[PDB]
Design a protein around this motif. Structure first.
Motif, PDB file in Angstrom:
ATOM      1  N   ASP A 127       0.562  -1.379  -0.088  1.00  0.00           N
ATOM      2  CA  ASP A 127      -0.253   0.001  -0.270  1.00  0.00           C
ATOM      3  C   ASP A 127       1.083   1.198   0.082  1.00  0.00           C
ATOM      4  OD1 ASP A 127      -2.695  -1.311  -0.131  1.00  0.00           O
ATOM      5  OD2 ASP A 127      -2.396  -1.773   1.760  1.00  0.00           O
ATOM      6  N   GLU A 150       1.228   4.085  -3.340  1.00  0.00           N
ATOM      7  CA  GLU A 150       1.160   5.454  -3.568  1.00  0.00           C
ATOM      8  C   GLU A 150       1.777   6.440  -3.850  1.00  0.00           C
ATOM      9  OE1 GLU A 150      -1.386   8.138  -0.334  1.00  0.00           O
ATOM     10  OE2 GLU A 150       0.121   7.406   0.604  1.00  0.00           O
ATOM     11  N   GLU A 201       2.641   6.046 -10.094  1.00  0.00           N
ATOM     12  CA  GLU A 201       2.036   6.661 -11.525  1.00  0.00           C
ATOM     13  C   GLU A 201       1.488   5.562 -12.349  1.00  0.00           C
ATOM     14  OE1 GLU A 201       0.397   9.272 -10.232  1.00  0.00           O
ATOM     15  OE2 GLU A 201       1.143  10.175  -8.204  1.00  0.00           O
ATOM     16  N   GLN A 209      -1.615  -8.602   3.255  1.00  0.00           N
ATOM     17  CA  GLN A 209      -3.078  -7.633   3.550  1.00  0.00           C
ATOM     18  C   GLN A 209      -2.748  -6.300   4.410  1.00  0.00           C
ATOM     19  OE1 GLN A 209      -6.564  -9.615   2.472  1.00  0.00           O
ATOM     20  NE2 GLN A 209      -6.400  -9.995   0.774  1.00  0.00           N
ATOM     21  N   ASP A 221      -4.859  -3.424   6.526  1.00  0.00           N
ATOM     22  CA  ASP A 221      -6.558  -3.169   6.452  1.00  0.00           C
ATOM     23  C   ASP A 221      -6.607  -1.319   6.915  1.00  0.00           C
ATOM     24  OD1 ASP A 221      -8.251  -4.568   5.639  1.00  0.00           O
ATOM     25  OD2 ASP A 221      -8.050  -6.090   7.410  1.00  0.00           O
ATOM     26  N   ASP A 222      -5.508  -1.007   7.586  1.00  0.00           N
ATOM     27  CA  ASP A 222      -5.427   0.352   7.547  1.00  0.00           C
ATOM     28  C   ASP A 222      -6.712   1.436   7.903  1.00  0.00           C
ATOM     29  OD1 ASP A 222      -5.956   2.503   4.714  1.00  0.00           O
ATOM     30  OD2 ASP A 222      -4.678   0.826   4.691  1.00  0.00           O
ATOM     31  N   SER A 247      -9.314  -4.825  -6.057  1.00  0.00           N
ATOM     32  CA  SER A 247      -9.567  -5.930  -5.501  1.00  0.00           C
ATOM     33  C   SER A 247     -10.653  -5.446  -3.954  1.00  0.00           C
ATOM     34  CB  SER A 247      -8.429  -7.500  -5.206  1.00  0.00           C
ATOM     35  OG  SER A 247      -9.870  -8.377  -5.128  1.00  0.00           O
ATOM     36  N   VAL A 288     -11.587  -9.420   0.001  1.00  0.00           N
ATOM     37  CA  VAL A 288     -12.089 -10.208   1.288  1.00  0.00           C
ATOM     38  C   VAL A 288     -12.973  -9.026   2.067  1.00  0.00           C
ATOM     39  CG1 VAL A 288     -10.082  -7.766   2.074  1.00  0.00           C
ATOM     40  CG2 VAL A 288     -10.773  -9.469   3.571  1.00  0.00           C
ATOM     41  N   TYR A 289     -13.059  -7.561   1.846  1.00  0.00           N
ATOM     42  CA  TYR A 289     -13.880  -6.446   2.355  1.00  0.00           C
ATOM     43  C   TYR A 289     -15.613  -7.364   1.850  1.00  0.00           C
ATOM     44  CZ  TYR A 289      -9.792  -3.894   2.646  1.00  0.00           C
ATOM     45  OH  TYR A 289      -8.660  -4.318   2.487  1.00  0.00           O
ATOM     46  N   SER A 299      -8.555   1.866  12.782  1.00  0.00           N
ATOM     47  CA  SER A 299      -8.716   1.907  11.070  1.00  0.00           C
ATOM     48  C   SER A 299      -9.967   2.778  11.218  1.00  0.00           C
ATOM     49  CB  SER A 299      -9.115   0.824  10.876  1.00  0.00           C
ATOM     50  OG  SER A 299      -9.740  -0.002  10.991  1.00  0.00           O
ATOM     51  N   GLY A 352      -9.364   3.647   4.254  1.00  0.00           N
ATOM     52  CA  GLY A 352      -7.705   4.453   3.436  1.00  0.00           C
ATOM     53  C   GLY A 352      -7.909   4.630   2.543  1.00  0.00           C
ATOM     54  N   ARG A 353      -7.688   2.945   1.602  1.00  0.00           N
ATOM     55  CA  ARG A 353      -7.940   2.764   0.555  1.00  0.00           C
ATOM     56  C   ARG A 353      -8.574   3.554  -0.922  1.00  0.00           C
ATOM     57  NH1 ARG A 353      -8.603  -3.201  -2.829  1.00  0.00           N
ATOM     58  NH2 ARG A 353      -7.794  -4.345  -1.316  1.00  0.00           N
ATOM     59  N   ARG A 369      -7.080   7.047  -0.700  1.00  0.00           N
ATOM     60  CA  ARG A 369      -6.002   6.984  -1.644  1.00  0.00           C
ATOM     61  C   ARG A 369      -6.022   6.053  -3.005  1.00  0.00           C
ATOM     62  NH1 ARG A 369      -4.269   3.466   2.652  1.00  0.00           N
ATOM     63  NH2 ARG A 369      -4.762   1.685   1.878  1.00  0.00           N
ATOM     64  N   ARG A 387      -7.513  10.072  -4.439  1.00  0.00           N
ATOM     65  CA  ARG A 387      -5.761  11.132  -4.638  1.00  0.00           C
ATOM     66  C   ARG A 387      -5.341  10.423  -6.073  1.00  0.00           C
ATOM     67  NH1 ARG A 387      -5.299  11.190   1.319  1.00  0.00           N
ATOM     68  NH2 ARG A 387      -3.913   9.076   1.438  1.00  0.00           N
ATOM     69  N   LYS A 388      -5.179   9.377  -5.997  1.00  0.00           N
ATOM     70  CA  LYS A 388      -4.735   8.942  -7.118  1.00  0.00           C
ATOM     71  C   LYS A 388      -5.139   8.821  -8.553  1.00  0.00           C
ATOM     72  CE  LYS A 388      -1.094   7.013  -7.173  1.00  0.00           C
ATOM     73  NZ  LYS A 388      -0.833   5.757  -7.040  1.00  0.00           N
ATOM     74  N   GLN A 438      -3.072 -14.060   4.576  1.00  0.00           N
ATOM     75  CA  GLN A 438      -4.489 -14.048   3.966  1.00  0.00           C
ATOM     76  C   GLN A 438      -4.595 -15.159   3.932  1.00  0.00           C
ATOM     77  OE1 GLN A 438      -7.877 -15.003   3.896  1.00  0.00           O
ATOM     78  NE2 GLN A 438      -7.486 -12.229   4.089  1.00  0.00           N
ATOM     79  N   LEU A 479      -9.291 -15.272  -1.266  1.00  0.00           N
ATOM     80  CA  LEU A 479      -9.368 -13.680  -0.963  1.00  0.00           C
ATOM     81  C   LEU A 479      -8.006 -13.086  -1.416  1.00  0.00           C
ATOM     82  CD1 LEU A 479     -11.688 -13.529   2.171  1.00  0.00           C
ATOM     83  CD2 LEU A 479     -12.528 -13.674   0.368  1.00  0.00           C
ATOM     84  N   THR A 482      -4.517 -10.002  -3.414  1.00  0.00           N
ATOM     85  CA  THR A 482      -5.540  -9.744  -3.300  1.00  0.00           C
ATOM     86  C   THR A 482      -5.583 -10.015  -5.053  1.00  0.00           C
ATOM     87  OG1 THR A 482      -4.944  -7.616  -1.978  1.00  0.00           O
ATOM     88  CG2 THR A 482      -4.808  -6.900  -3.776  1.00  0.00           C
TER      89      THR A 482
END
Lengths: 267, 181, 267
Positions: free
Chosen positions: A120, A124, A127, A264, A266-267, B4, B7-8, B97, B109-110, B113, B116-117, C2, C7, C9
């Motif tokens: 993650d 970021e 690009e 993975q 989860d932040d 993806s 998981v959620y 979180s 959070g993702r 991001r 923003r991306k 995971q 699951l 990614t």
């Protein structure tokens, strides 16, 4: 650590302490500096330990590079290792049946690009115009040094139309001693300097620069600004270091787990 | 764009149908639903924020885009879910979180991001991904609820693609929302 | 990590991979397990380093204990060490002039109680009826062992009306090898078992029990830790929280106790 003692969480209790008790706290502050100094020697030994373990890690990293590049074939034992875990009831069999072998597909294409962009923090920084450049990444390595103290991360690129460099190198010089001007703040190795690498871009391929209108050249967002490190420019160094740490400590040792996405956040 | 949410989507399924599974092919379709609705919501929020003040995508622009993309009753419930998550996130606080602070499973959070991306605007406020996560989570929960119902009506415990198909095409608003996908 | 492979990614990308490329990924998964095994050896070496450095840390901790208990007087160097950093003008002078010396105040009262309760995680475990008991805490020490692998924390209590024990001991047995049934999940040493200590409470002083006899919330439930698999649900999470609290005390609070006493360390 809060350098402004007046912002201490328990300042009011400290202020109310009798003088003879205050001087005992002063002794503990002096003793605390000696504890931190010993901690500095501990981190130096750990750094030497990390250097020592490069030779032990090296063969698993070498074999991974050869597998990714298609220079060696998987063994029977390696084929018998499940591509993913936790698949029950013919799920693994159907997975292997989903796509027939393609003899024109050599090694594992886009291995490091996929691994880097699944983390993650590194994602970021990547690009869209960095994606086809990182496709040419054949390996990502790291090595540490005792003198000067620090480590480097090297990005190996096959012949590509973006730049002439085979290897892009990022180097961090680390300080392992406490700051003599602020000894209580030490909490491990800290960055003194980040040294990047000059990218020999082909004509019109430099995604890190763009002109704005007098006409001046300014930084454009790109992962490859990782190789041109620097009021708040000191936090930018800390963010750059944190990305370097993630690549060295997390992504490189567990690259395939980011390639698959088994690791993975989860932040 | 190829993101993806499996998981959620799975954690939402266990909240909606605790003893129901989902096949990998049906999970890929669910990801296509969430990615497509995200792209349409973000593109509309980007248009509303092209010459906004400070070119800011906040919960306001998400909410307006939600009303434009989503049909009648789906939009009102998505809006209510969005404001509730923003309200809970605003009064929230080990470091929790952003999704747990908003009471959501979808990754705040993702999504922040990704917004923003994509360069949809110059600035993406903290409330925009909270609102958007609640909307995508609500839509996933609604689809998984009806797909899980179609699964056990077929005497199954695992959501297959045909269960996703019938659940969407037999709901008027979900069918209009996800017809193109 | 995971555990449910479906699951992951990048599952769809993995699924689309041709079979011969999938088998190369399976070689990388096998190689990843070998990398993790070497990483486990690294953590064992780090553990040995921590044991080796105990002799140097202990003397700074021993001197701190003597200061806290009032068994030795601060030296001239220790008095000349500022009680807090970042003090301007007359603020340090006014601090020392803010409270007259009290010869009846011996050592540093409530040192470990204040240090422990300034750490955010440990503060949550301290109830109000635990506060006067922790006031009798004279020292908190920690030591690590190679066989059996783990560490202990010892809580030293002056004679107090709550229990007769001089030392309350918390012991963690740690596993340094990867789970042979799930090798890819290994991310460092993991707790196998936590062993507490029998508290010899005086009559009516057991703050861990209430009549309502049922379990009451108290820090001293730290010394009756959750059981492991062989000594019996969600008891595995209770074991991890207890281990995490033990880690905070050993790794963070003990080496930097005075910084939590003053509140110079903030989150």
């Amino acid at each position: 650590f809060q350098h402004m003692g007046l912002l201490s969480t328990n300042f009011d209790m400290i202020q109310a302490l009798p003088l003879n008790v205050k001087q005992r706290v002063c002794a503990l502050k002096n003793l605390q500096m000696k504890t931190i100094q010993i901690e500095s020697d501990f981190y130096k030994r750990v750094h030497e330990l990390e250097i020592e373990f490069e030779g032990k890690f090296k063969s698993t990293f070498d074999q991974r590079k050869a597998i990714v590049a298609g220079e060696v074939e998987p063994t029977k034992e390696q084929i018998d290792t499940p591509i993913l875990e936790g698949l029950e009831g013919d799920q693994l069999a159907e997975l292997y049946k989903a796509a027939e072998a393609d003899p024109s597909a050599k090694g594992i294409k886009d291995f490091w690009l996929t691994a880097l962009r699944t983390h993650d923090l590194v994602a970021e920084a990547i690009e869209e115009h960095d994606v086809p450049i990182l496709s040419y990444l054949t390996d990502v390595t790291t090595a540490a040094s005792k003198d000067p103290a620090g480590f480097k991360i090297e990005f190996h690129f096959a012949t590509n139309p973006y730049f002439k460099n085979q290897v892009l190198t990022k180097t961090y010089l680390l300080g392992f001693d406490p700051d003599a001007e602020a000894p209580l703040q030490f909490d491990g190795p800290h960055v003194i300097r980040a040294v990047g690498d000059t990218i020999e871009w082909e004509d019109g391929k430099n995604v890190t620069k763009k002109a704005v209108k007098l006409t001046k050249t300014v930084k454009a967002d790109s992962f490859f600004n990782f190789f041109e490190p620097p009021e708040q420019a000191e936090e930018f160094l800390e963010l750059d270091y944190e990305m370097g740490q993630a690549i060295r400590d997390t992504i490189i040792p567990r690259a395939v787990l980011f390639y698959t996405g088994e690791l993975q956040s989860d932040d | 764009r190829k993101e993806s949410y499996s998981v959620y989507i799975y954690r939402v399924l266990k909240q909606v149908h605790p003893d129901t599974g989902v096949s990998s092919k049906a999970m890929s379709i669910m990801n296509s639903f969430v990615n497509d609705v995200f792209e349409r919501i973000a593109a509309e929020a980007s248009r509303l924020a092209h010459y906004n003040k400070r070119s800011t995508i906040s919960s306001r622009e998400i909410q307006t885009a939600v009303r434009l993309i989503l049909p009648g009753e789906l939009a009102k419930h998505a809006v209510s879910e969005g404001t509730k998550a923003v309200t809970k996130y605003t009064s929230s606080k080990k470091a929790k979180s952003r999704s747990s602070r908003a009471g959501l499973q979808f990754p705040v959070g993702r999504l922040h991001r990704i917004l923003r991306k994509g360069n949809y605007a110059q600035r993406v406020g903290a409330g925009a991904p909270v609102y958007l996560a609640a909307v995508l989570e609500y839509l996933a929960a609604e689809v998984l609820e009806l797909a899980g119902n179609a699964a056990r009506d077929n005497k199954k415990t695992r959501i297959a693609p045909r269960h996703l198909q019938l659940a969407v095409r037999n709901d008027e608003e979900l069918n209009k929302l996800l017809a193109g996908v």
